[PDB]
């Protein structure tokens, strides 16, 4: 394959869960009748991270993540701090 053994498309999905975050995918259609292109915006906790756009929803939603990923690596979720014997 290419662009990673699996890709970022999934990175986010697993990323959010790890950071007990909330990932959402909004689907908005282009006012203009044609052409017809699906769009999916990835929002993490009511926050705009990435936005994918393609001929099909899937293709869109997918890419969306790719953007959300890099966005995290640059600007992660400002957290206070984790601490506890629950796990070490």
Curated annotation (Swiss-Prot):
It comes from the Eukaryota. Autophosphorylated on several Ser, Thr and Tyr residues. Autophosphorylation apparently leads to the activation of the kinase. Tyrosine autophosphorylation is essential for efficient dsRNA-binding, dimerization, and kinase activation. It is found in: Cytoplasm; Nucleus; Cytoplasm, Perinuclear region. Induction: By type I interferons. There is a cross-link at residue 66 (Glycyl lysine isopeptide (Lys-Gly) (interchain with G-Cter in ISG15)). The modification Phosphotyrosine is found at residues 8, 69. Expressed in heart, lung, brain, kidney, testes, thymus and bone marrow. Disruption phenotype: Mice have significantly elevated numbers of bone marrow derived hematopoietic stem/progenitor cells (HSPCs) and which are more actively proliferating and resistant to stress. Residues 8-74 form the DRBM domain. Homodimer. Interacts with DNAJC3 and STRBP. Forms a complex with FANCA, FANCC, FANCG and HSP70. Interacts with ADAR/ADAR1. The inactive form interacts with NCK1. Interacts (via the kinase catalytic domain) with STAT3 (via SH2 domain), TRAF2 (C-terminus), TRAF5 (C-terminus) and TRAF6 (C-terminus). Interacts with MAP2K6, TARBP2, NLRP1, NLRC4 and AIM2. Interacts (via DRBM 1 domain) with DUS2L (via DRBM domain). Interacts with DHX9 (via N-terminus) and this interaction is dependent upon activation of the kinase. The inactive form interacts with GSN. Interacts with IKBKB/IKKB, NPM1, NLRP3 and IRS1. IFN-induced dsRNA-dependent serine/threonine-protein kinase that phosphorylates the alpha subunit of eukaryotic translation initiation factor 2 (EIF2S1/eIF-2-alpha) and plays a key role in the innate immune response to viral infection. Belongs to the protein kinase superfamily. Ser/Thr protein kinase family. GCN2 subfamily. This is Interferon-induced, double-stranded RNA-activated protein kinase. It comes from Mus musculus (Mouse). The gene is Eif2ak2. The chain holds residues 96 to 170 of 515 of the full protein.
